[PDB]
Ligand binder design. Structure first.
Ligand SMILES: CC(=O)N[C@@H]1[C@@H](O)[C@H](O[C@@H]2O[C@H](CO)[C@H](O)[C@H](O[C@H]3O[C@H](CO)[C@H](O)[C@H](O)[C@H]3NC(C)=O)[C@H]2O[C@@H]2O[C@@H](C)[C@@H](O)[C@@H](O)[C@@H]2O)[C@@H](CO)O[C@H]1O
Ligand SMILES: CC(=O)N[C@@H]1[C@@H](O)[C@H](O[C@@H]2O[C@H](CO)[C@H](O)[C@H](O[C@H]3O[C@H](CO)[C@H](O)[C@H](O)[C@H]3NC(C)=O)[C@H]2O[C@@H]2O[C@@H](C)[C@@H](O)[C@@H](O)[C@@H]2O)[C@@H](CO)O[C@H]1O
Ligand SMILES: [Ca+2]
Ligand SMILES: [Mg+2]
Length: 844
């Protein structure tokens, strides 16, 4: 029970009207129903047809000749601090037709004649006759109570809307229509609404919501940001997709994909990671294509129910604000019930639910550009007003940011609210090599100060575009099979590369694979995401200052996808690098001209007390095919030798094998700390492995964490040994397509961490070799397993004990270990001696 309530619903209200007015169905004014849906139990269809919009409400009819104006008054029974009023009257003159929307033949929109009421006013006070009345809203010339002055500024009529109209307690803020700071209240017992129907003596009041507090003590206040998102406070987002089943009034919380629940997903998060996690409520295909009355009812009911369950658990929430250009803005689609968003309702969710933090936008521009920018500009302002945030997820082929800023309203909203705005990549279209350019754009936007930060959405749909079985191409498998195919450790490699670039947001799909089903944690979540995210929570990423200090070159403009080849790495579609030598290579998109972006970057650098990096156009002669390698190699000295990825950040080495689906060993030769500069570690790894190494500093010891967790899908998914149905079709009496049910069944029965009787432990028992060669040493060093991933219930080990071989002649120690999972090693008793033959750390 949060402190802001609908007092009109909560209290035993009394409804009255004036002299020469008749009142019918007073109870409907405060019943919490704006839509009067009748077929919730059958998906809001009568047979195969969406239910018609039937407007019910409190009818007030003037019986005075020559005076069609009426009023209705609610007595809350006592005085309460009021913050928001929601007024809805009959929207349509006659009936709405369920008409064609966008796309044609699929999307439904109401069409008909909307009413523009006139002589509307809202007056509140503590006297039953409102002799002490305070004007909340005033349009036209309705006669106010004796003692109440006319306002100097009077409003003009508006068109009645599906969600009603929203009023606040500051008459100076757009004549009462302007959203106030949290906790802006006026005390009142009595709320009177004047209205004249342009046609006739009767007004139908569908709903009057009166939001306020039990007492002054409960009144809320804006107390800085709801969340900090930065290197010291990173954020993991998990998508909570509706399973597309919901009935207004249901007692149980909204069902999510894969038998998950909002509270169940929250309680699955390890306690020490909960403060760095959020849940994203996603309407998915819930009431997809529905006309306005059904779409808005379900968008609100689904999100409110989720928010309430999250509030009880202390779980912070983001809502999906916009996908597939499904916005109420002119030209929007109805691909999602986000098409029925009421900005006044979104404002109310921030006031009502202190755990409401953010809005998410993804995958719009395929379906339209300007309408989703118009919507995003409004929702970014709302989020920032309440100290919340806005996350935009997309891959940038070159036009994504340019499109965002091509919209005048979105450009202006970013100028004012940019610190609450975050861009994260989205590698779904892994076959288009824009992964590395997107990271550059999003890092550059943050670095120059256009945005609050950047991060990642790694999507296992990326596997589907290229690969199936381990080491193999996509072949002719069903896409739902290929979705299950991605190596778990590869998600950690992506998380490590985003971390090293000062990324602060981490998200993964498909959620039922990467996070889990049935309110359990998946193998990916248990053995990779929670393990590395804990590291990232406890070891801050580079700050903006730390990235700016280490950045020698910032690029401007539409960088070529393949620019990264010969520098940081060939774009794979999987958001990983061949080397950390050059970092991400920030590229500022066309937020402004090159000169404008340069002034912005210099001001940002100056605020941080750092030398501004040089800004080069992507077309600069230094950045040509033939010149870029010498140019970058001269700016950034080599830190290690080899074809594996390595980067040294804050005295720690970060490595991985960078082969996505080719079985090749790679190595990194690292110059080691301590008095003996000739000291070397050669690490050699097979694919799907990342490593964190932290030297004692004096040359005697090092700690190494490696993680190469990988489940084998070849037999259970691709050979389909359990005969799952992998198709995009529905079976009779199912609301979910067979391929998706097959993903859930795989995660529920065949791929279970700590598998109970009758379920299968993960196929993760085939081990792979890591070797460490240390030169040149006086004697054999000591290696031990400080801690290692333990068996599943099948009792099979995830690692073997490390073996050490020391050649006393060459002074080379070789440490060998076999793993599938994580191990923490400690190497001690190192005595390095001068090695005239040590690998030189220099370019070829
Ligand atoms: C032109 C183009 O291709 N546009 C891109 C879309 O195709 C992307 O949509 C996703 O496509 C997936 C296949 O690659 C898949 O169909 C997915 O829907 C299915 O999976 C999601 C989870 O990822 C949900 O479980 C859905 O319910 C499920 N569909 C069904 C019918 O069961 C698509 O993604 C969803 O739809 C888009 C529009 C967004 O709302 C996403 O957040 C959804 O998850 C799209 C996503 O990256 O990118 C476009 O550019
Ligand atoms: C008595 C007898 O012959 N024992 C058998 C073992 O030798 C088998 O182990 C595999 O042997 C292969 C050579 O004959 C090979 O070394 C293989 O490891 C290599 O391939 C795996 C494939 O994933 C990994 O890539 C390893 O990293 C790679 N090794 C190197 C040095 O690059 C061996 O399999 C591994 O080692 C065994 C002991 C187990 O730990 C497996 O989980 C590992 O994959 C063994 C399996 O075929 O069968 C015995 O009967
Ligand atoms: Ca195992
Ligand atoms: Mg009602």
């Amino acid at each position: 029970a949060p402190p802001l309530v609908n007092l009109a619903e909560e209290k035993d209200v009394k409804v009255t009207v004036g002299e020469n007015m008749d009142l019918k169905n007073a109870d409907l004014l405060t019943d919490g129903d704006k839509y009067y849906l009748q077929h919730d139990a059958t998906g809001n269809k009568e047979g195969n047809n969406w239910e018609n919009y039937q407007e019910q409400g409190t009818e007030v009819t003037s019986t005075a000749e020559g005076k069609n104006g009426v009023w209705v008054q609610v007595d809350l029974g006592a005085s309460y601090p009021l913050e928001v009023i929601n007024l809805k009257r009959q929207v349509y003159d006659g009936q709405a037709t369920i008409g064609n929307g966008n796309p044609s033949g699929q999307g439904k929109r109401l069409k008909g004649t909307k009413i523009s009421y006139k002589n509307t006013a809202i007056v509140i006070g503590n006297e039953e006759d409102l002799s002490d009345g305070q004007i909340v809203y005033y349009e036209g010339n309705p006669t106010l109570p004796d003692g109440v002055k006319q306002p100097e500024n009077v409003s003009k009529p508006y068109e009645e809307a599906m969600g009603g109209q929203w009023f606040y307690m500051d008459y100076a803020n757009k004549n009462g229509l302007g959203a106030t700071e949290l906790g802006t209240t006026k005390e009142a017992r009595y709320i009177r609404v004047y209205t004249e129907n342009p046609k006739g003596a009767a007004v139908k009041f569908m709903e009057l919501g009166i939001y306020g507090y039990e007492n002054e003590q409960d009144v809320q206040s804006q107390d800085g940001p709801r969340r900090v998102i930065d290197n010291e406070h990173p954020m993991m987002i998990a998508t909570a997709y509706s399973n597309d089943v919901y009935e207004i009034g249901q007692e149980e919380g909204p069902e999510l994909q894969g038998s998950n629940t909002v509270d169940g997903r929250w309680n699955a998060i390890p306690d020490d990671l909960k403060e760095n996690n959020v849940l994203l409520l996603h309407t998915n295909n819930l009431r997809q294509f529905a006309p306005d009355h059904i779409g808005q009812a379900y968008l609100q009911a689904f999100h409110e129910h989720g928010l309430q369950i999250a509030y009880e658990q202390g779980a912070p929430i983001m809502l999906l604000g916009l996908t597939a250009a499904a916005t109420p803005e002119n030209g929007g689609t109805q691909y999602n019930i986000t098409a029925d968003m009421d900005y006044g309702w979104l404002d109310l969710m921030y006031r009502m639910y202190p755990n409401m933090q953010g809005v998410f936008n993804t995958a719009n521009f395929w379906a339209g550009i300007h309408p989703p920018c118009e919507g995003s500009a409004k929702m970014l302002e709302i989020a920032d007003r309440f100290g919340g945030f806005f996350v935009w997820s997309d891959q940038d082929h070159g036009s994504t940011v340019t499109n965002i800023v091509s919209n005048a309203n979105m450009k202006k909203a970013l100028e004012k609210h940019g610190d609450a705005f975050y861009l994260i990549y989205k590698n779904t279209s892994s076959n288009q090599p824009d992964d590395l350019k997107t990271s550059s754009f999003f890092q550059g936007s943050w670095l120059a100060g256009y945005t609050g930060g950047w991060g990642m959405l790694s999507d296992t749909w990326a596997w589907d575009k290229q690969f199936s079985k381990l080491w193999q191409g996509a072949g002719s498998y069903n896409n739902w099979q290929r979705l299950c195919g991605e190596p778990e450790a590869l998600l950690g490699m992506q998380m490590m590369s985003t971390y090293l670039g000062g990324g602060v947001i981490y998200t993964f799909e498909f959620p039922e694979i990467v996070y889990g089903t049935s309110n359990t944690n998946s193998p990916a979540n248990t053995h990779v995401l929670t393990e590395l995210f804990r590291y990232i929570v406890n070891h801050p990423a580079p700050s903006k200052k730390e990235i700016m200090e280490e950045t020698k070159a910032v690029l401007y403009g539409n960088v070529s996808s393949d620019f990264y080849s010969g520098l940081s790495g060939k774009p794979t579609g999987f958001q990983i690098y061949e080397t950390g030598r050059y970092g991400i290579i920030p590229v500022i998109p066309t937020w402004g001209t090159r000169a404008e972006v340069t002034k912005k970057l210099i001001q940002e650098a100056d605020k941080l007390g750092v030398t501004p990096p040089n800004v080069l156009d992507v077309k600069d002669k230094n950045l040509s095919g033939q010149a870029k390698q010498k140019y970058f190699k001269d700016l950034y000295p080599i830190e290690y030798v080899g074809n594996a990825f390595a980067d040294k950040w804050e005295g720690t080495w970060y490595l991985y094998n960078n082969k996505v689906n080719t079985n090749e060993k790679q190595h990194a030769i690292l110059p080691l700390e301590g008095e003996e500069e000739s000291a070397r570690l050669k690490v050699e790894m097979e694919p799907h492995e990342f490593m964190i190494m932290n030297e004692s500093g004096d040359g005697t010891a090092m700690d190494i964490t490696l993680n190469n967790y990988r489940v084998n899908k070849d037999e259970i998914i691709f050979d389909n040994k359990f005969g799952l149905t992998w198709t995009g079709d529905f079976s009779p009496g199912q609301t979910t397509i067979n391929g998706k049910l097959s993903v859930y069944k795989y995660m529920d029965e065949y791929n279970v961490v700590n598998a109970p009787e009758g379920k299968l432990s993960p196929e993760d028992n085939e081990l792979r070799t890591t070797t460490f060669e240390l030169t040149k040493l006086a004697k054999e060093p000591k290696v031990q397993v400080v801690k290692g991933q333990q068996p599943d219930t099948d009792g099979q080990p995830q690692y073997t004990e490390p073996k050490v071989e020391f050649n006393e002649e060459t002074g080379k120690a070789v440490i060998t270990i076999q793993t599938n999972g994580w191990v923490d090693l400690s190497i001690t008793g190192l005595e390095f001696v001068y090695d005239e033959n040590a690998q030189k750390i220099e370019d070829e």
